[PDB]
Amino acid sequence: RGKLIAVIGDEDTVTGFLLGGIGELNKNRHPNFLVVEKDTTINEIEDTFRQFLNRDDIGIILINQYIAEMVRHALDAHQRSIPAVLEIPSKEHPYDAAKDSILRRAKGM
Amino acid sequence: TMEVDGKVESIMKRTALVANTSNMPVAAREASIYTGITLSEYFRDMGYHVSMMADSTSRWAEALREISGRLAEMPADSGYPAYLGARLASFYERAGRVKCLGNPEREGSVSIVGAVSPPGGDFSDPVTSATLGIVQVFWGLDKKLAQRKHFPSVNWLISYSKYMRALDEYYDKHFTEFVPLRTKAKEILQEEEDLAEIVQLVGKASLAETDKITLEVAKLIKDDFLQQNGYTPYDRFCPFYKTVGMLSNMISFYDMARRAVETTAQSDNKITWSIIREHMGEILYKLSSMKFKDPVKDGEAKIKADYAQLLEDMQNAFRSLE
Amino acid sequence: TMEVDGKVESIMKRTALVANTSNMPVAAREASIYTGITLSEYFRDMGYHVSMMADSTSRWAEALREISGRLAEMPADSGYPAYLGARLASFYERAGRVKCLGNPEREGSVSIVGAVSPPGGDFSDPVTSATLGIVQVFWGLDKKLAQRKHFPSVNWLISYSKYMRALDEYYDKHFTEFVPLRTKAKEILQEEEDLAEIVQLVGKASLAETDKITLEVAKLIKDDFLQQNGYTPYDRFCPFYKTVGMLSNMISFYDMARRAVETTAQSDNKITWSIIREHMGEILYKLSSMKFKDPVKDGEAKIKADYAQLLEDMQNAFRSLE
Amino acid sequence: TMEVDGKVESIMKRTALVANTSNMPVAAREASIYTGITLSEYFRDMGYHVSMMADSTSRWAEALREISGRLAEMPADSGYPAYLGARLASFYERAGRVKCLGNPEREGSVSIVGAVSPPGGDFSDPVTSATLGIVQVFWGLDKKLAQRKHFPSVNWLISYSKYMRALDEYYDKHFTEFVPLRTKAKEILQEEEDLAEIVQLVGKASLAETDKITLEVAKLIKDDFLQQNGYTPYDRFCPFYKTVGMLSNMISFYDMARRAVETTAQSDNKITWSIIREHMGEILYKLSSMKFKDPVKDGEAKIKADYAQLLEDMQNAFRSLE
Amino acid sequence: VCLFLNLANDPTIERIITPRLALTTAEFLAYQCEKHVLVILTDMSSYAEALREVSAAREEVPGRRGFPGYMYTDLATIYERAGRVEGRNGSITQIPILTMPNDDITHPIPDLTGYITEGQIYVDRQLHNRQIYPPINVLPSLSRLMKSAIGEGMTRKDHADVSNQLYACYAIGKDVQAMKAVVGEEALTSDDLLYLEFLQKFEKNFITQGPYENRTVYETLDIGWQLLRIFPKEMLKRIPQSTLSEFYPR
Amino acid sequence: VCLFLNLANDPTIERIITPRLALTTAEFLAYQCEKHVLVILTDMSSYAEALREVSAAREEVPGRRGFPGYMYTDLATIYERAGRVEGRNGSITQIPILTMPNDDITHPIPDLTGYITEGQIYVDRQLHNRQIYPPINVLPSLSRLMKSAIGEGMTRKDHADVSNQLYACYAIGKDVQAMKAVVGEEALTSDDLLYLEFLQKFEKNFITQGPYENRTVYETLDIGWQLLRIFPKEMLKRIPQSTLSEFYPR
Amino acid sequence: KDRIEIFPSRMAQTIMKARLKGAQTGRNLLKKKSDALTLRFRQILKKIIETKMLMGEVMREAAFSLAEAKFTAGDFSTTVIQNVNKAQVKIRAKKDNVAGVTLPVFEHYHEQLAKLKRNYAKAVELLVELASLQTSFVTLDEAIKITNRRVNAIEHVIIPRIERTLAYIITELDEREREEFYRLKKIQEKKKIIKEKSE
Ligand SMILES: Nc1ncnc2c1ncn2[C@@H]1O[C@H](COP(=O)(O)OP(=O)(O)O)[C@@H](O)[C@H]1O
Hints:
The structure is cut from a larger assembly and holds 1 copy of chain A, 3 copies of chain B, 2 copies of chain E and 1 copy of chain G.
Chain A: E1 5-9, H1 11-20, E2 33-35, H2 42-54, E3 60-64, H3 65-70, H4 72-77, E4 85-88
Parallel strand pairs in A: 1-2, 1-3, 3-4
Chain B: E1 2-4, E2 7-9, H1 26-30, H2 32-45, E3 49-52, H3 57-71, H4 84-92, E4 96-98, E5 108-112, H5 126-134, E6 137-138, H6 143-147, E7 160-161, H7 164-174, H8 178-202, H9 209-226, H10 240-263, H11 273-279, H12 281-289, H13 300-321
Parallel strand pairs in B: 3-5
Antiparallel strand pairs in B: 1-2, 4-5, 6-7
Helix pairs in contact in B: 4-5, 8-9, 8-10, 9-10, 10-13
Chain G: H1 10-73, H2 77-82, E1 89-98, E2 101-110, H3 113-198
Antiparallel strand pairs in G: 1-2
Helix pairs in contact in G: 1-3
The structure holds adenosine-5'-diphosphate (ADP).
Adenosine-5'-diphosphate (ADP) sits between chains D (151-152, 228-231) and F (142, 144, 147).
Subcellular location (chain A): Cytoplasmic vesicle, Secretory vesicle, Synaptic vesicle membrane; Cytoplasmic vesicle, Clathrin-coated vesicle membrane
Pfam families (chain A): ATP-synt_F
Keywords (chain A): Cytoplasmic vesicle, Hydrogen ion transport, Ion transport, Membrane, Synapse, Transport
């Protein structure tokens, strides 16, 4: 009944989060995580991301900064609050305060 | 008392008082304005410059409405007579500068400073509306500024003066630089008023360096130029040369700070209002202290020289910083 | 009919009617009030307490206005004669308690109840304005309560009675505990008036527990103490012992519930209005049904005992809660 | 000119003017009106359907007021004489369709179209109030719509015509399809009025999609059906076949848009107003430009065929959309 | 006390001449017997009604809102028979009392009274309903010449500062009540709670007096300081430190 | 130029004849000397108030706000002395300048003047305070003979359509401003932004004008077209496609 | 439109004055609500920036710990990804209250390599707070926009409407008084003329 946490990032970030204890397989065995390998394209990331948002038990969603930039349009379209989406750094790309889908709402920053 | 020829005479040697309270005959109250303006015209015709001050033309208008009601005349807009506007206009038309009648070539004037009382601060009643339509200056005293301890309490936003175009010639003759200084000061104050809302919306940290300069010189003008204490011996009376000198120094500081900020926006070592304040706290303190020059002890020459030295110091500091 | 000395007797045996329809001559409509008050004064002089009811002083004022117009007199505001206030005073002030003339000592009284009906419920109606400066009691009308069908429709916020001070002596000897109950009831009603504006403007979520007690006790008082249907066998006439007992129960509940919520505030076992309501819905229902006691069959002793039992149940239930 | 038996003949051959301009003697204005109507009656008795345009009955009422003032008569509301309503009613009562006098059986009419000029645009004016109690049709004009150049400025909300039930008999046999179109158009306009009252305070964010369609089709009807530039070759005269064809097309578009939106609300491919507007920009512009059809340059047959083609385009586009 | 009673059912011309009798007696006692007189003229609205009746008797047309056009002059004639005079140790203070009809401050009687007089003491229906006596609202009320009536040698050194701080804290307390009504009690800060406490204790101790509770102005200032000692010295920004250091302690 | 001057200090009743004298002269210069006379009657508010004074002295039946019941007829006697005449090559053009009291266009003076005259040029305080000269708010302004003074032949053939479209777009821009005051910037659609841009550039480039700048009618129409080109053709619903195709593209 | 269309009268004037005062009080209360919401909104915004900065460090430390772990344990990513089973850390919805607005928030709850587990548990502890902050931030943004729209609507539509209605009512009552004065003056003149006629 409680909410979960979802991850969309590199294999290393996914492994770290799983070691954190975030992943689970649902009744349909669907996972709440994804590893963005080079074999995975933008459309796949957008589709799995949409699946994560439509699912009602997801709760938090974590996306790497560069991945978030890749699917930025989907992030911006998502406007409701409950599916909390967070943009997190990576060893591949650093995190920057600018251009975060949530911080778009603030001009006093 | 007033100091004339170095002696402290009483202003009643040159003043007359048409004083009457609210229980006097209504005709006395209604004719008070006319008696005052006729005495003022008499002393204008003698070659003098008279200054008539009606303490509250609203009470005179109430007396006029009372007389109308007593005569059973048709009630015009909101009860006032059918000629309130005509009477006010014809009274204020008696003010002016004249080539006095008579053989000895003279020139007198009567300046009417008649005050009005808007109901609860509303400038829409017939008397206030007619007065504001007729008069050419409005000094708009505010209780809000009085509470803030900003004396004189002229709100400097609702006030206005339509004699600027008439005084352009006089300024250009005697005070050549005053007109641009006044225009710049007014625009600074308007910009500060407009930025007060942006400060609420995004805070001070979100203001540009030019906006910070505008705000921090608008504060300087508000607190150290417009604000003036009538009790102190140094700035109870501020000669116009002193006023123009202070405004010149303030607007010079503004312009050179703005120039520095704009011309260092292209560099990596961009200047900020904080940088300028840290470097020239002394200059800002001197700008705040320009008030404290005594026109009597510090003659016109000394005050002008001190303001010129201040300007030299601001130029040196800005040149070093820039 | 009425019960006097154990017998049902017609009301006509101590009642007189001065019937004056609207189509009767206006002069008769003007003299009707005077005839009524003269008969009332006559029976006051006998040593009786005469209760007089003027069906409409507004129609009396209309008669005065019409006669004034027919006489070609100059009217006051809204066309009434300028002596309307004088006539209303001459009529009303004939009321009062008096040591009647004549040697055999006696004390009579005439209690005038004048009915007013301004145009469209206007509170500035000249007849109503003249009335309010004379009458000591004024049972104003709530158009909202009338539309909601809340009877009596007295609007307890502007209606007033200046006889409370004179009645303090009677209450502190016969109903010693009633005055604080009335004070607390008025305070509660005013607090509800202040809170409803906010509940409807913004929302009900921010209310404190004490505010909830105030609102719900105000609903209780308004719906089941200030709401009296006069057509029922039980509520046609409410004896003052019934009134004071009911108000005592409601105010006791108010005080004790507020004590609970305040004492348990800043404590682990916090008490809220919801907890109280859920625990003792029976107590609230009994307080609501208190108005149903019928003095005719439920004697004074029975009603007082039932209200004491309700108070005991309230105290027991709050002791269990605490 | 108008065509009679295929020959063009000037319309001045049937128009008679009775001119009394504003600066011509005031007392003549009344006579003017009367003369006018009498002439109309004369041509009504021949069997002609006369139409009398009273350019401003407010000026006649003002003339009556001046003559009354000179007579020192007691005024009615706002100075007008006590017989203004009677005069207006007696003048308007001369309008009805009649079975003319005399031996040859005929049938005339005098349609009185009397413009009113309320001072200050306030329809509470005694002349306007008295006129609305007589006239069966009320083409109230709005100053705001005129300022937007929304001519004719008729306010579709307050205006009314009490002849619609008497004209449905004729519409059902000559324009059988028009009465439901009129009813739906008035429904659309009223719904848009309610939604605009809501939107002014809440905005369009929360509007239901069908409410958006109502708003947009109401804007279409206002800007492109109701308003009619009377100084253009195409909109100076709008025959009734045009007046009904344009309304039929707009109401058909409303019906189709509402059907699509309602029937696809449950489906995943939710059609909204934006989808329709993007898909049907050309069709919406064609509906807007329907007014530009020229009754004379383009024949009736051509206009009807073009409107039918626009209906076909609408049907095909909606089918291709759904 | 010299008491003049004009009952509602007594002639109205007697009502016209009542205030003139009262003020003639006040002038005799003040400017001839040299004693400080206080004239309380009750229900000037009833006097205005009598003036209207006499004006109608004269057959004059009604003025504004049905009252005589010269009502301003008549009210000025009544009120302005007051004040200190040169060379005489007596005075005449005036406290006219008005029944604002329809609670409309724009009505001619209260309007012209405010035009002629020098202050106002508002009796509030809200405080009255809340059962506070005297139900005198101190926010809309005003006394133009309060500054001339206070200070060292007249009332005390701290009268003006205490009054200003009490007014400021009362206004802030009303504002904080309005805020609490929207945010909730928990969301309020410590200073907001202090302001609410001061508001309650000010309406319960300062305003609420009781009919027969006579407080010397020193007692009034002591109560004011008891209420100001709710806040720490720093929040009393309208009281100069020279006064706080002397009167705040204890 | 022939001047008739009745200053503020001059007799009030004489103002009732100052217009007529002037107009009489104009008539002589126009219908007998065949001049083209521009008549300017300054402060018709003063003339109307003088007329009100005389009527009040005569106790004549008042209209709205105390003005005489015949003020329309008198103002018409003044205004209706204009226009051309058959067989005479002169004309009289009247431009009365009247001060609306309290900026109330419904006041009897401006209202009756608008009822009589053939239009009005509405000088606006909102524009003046913004320092837009001439502060002429075209929306409440009107010219009743514009419909026939423009078109093909005189001036250009897009004059009427351009004027109507400018009116519509200006009104919609004002409506968008009103809605934006409530719903804020972020809730405006792209069309609302188009209308706001049109309003800004219209008040900056069309209304705003130098005090000595003499724009020809063709320059005015070119400015109007350059403003209308903000919108796409489909958003200009007043202009028929025939005019848009020829004038819009350039 | 411009006016409420209540017929001019003293009762109507009183009703409109009461309505104006009520509208002003409601506007002030909604403005205070907007002020409270905006204060909490800016506090949460500053907290969000600070938490993003702190994440800038926690995530980096966790990633470096992951690198150190992989240095020894080898390629443990595949096994960790394959062995998911059931979540050991979950999120429980909670409510918070600011003015009358309810903010959704989250509860962290429990259902070399050891150091890596500790570091990523700490990272999740930080990111759950970040998610709660961002959810509250979005909710406050929406509520602030709605309340500011309400206040602007009041003070730009409703209050001006009532002020115009009051001005019109005052003008019309002045007109009624003027008409009554004219009628009474006319009656007085006629009475004087009749008295002269009798004399
Ligand atoms: N059907 C219409 N088409 C175009 N313009 C119109 C139409 N009706 C009115 N107008 C405009 O309204 C203005 C006022 O016209 P008119 O009716 O003479 O004024 P009034 O309302 O004083 O009678 C005219 O200048 C005209 O341009």
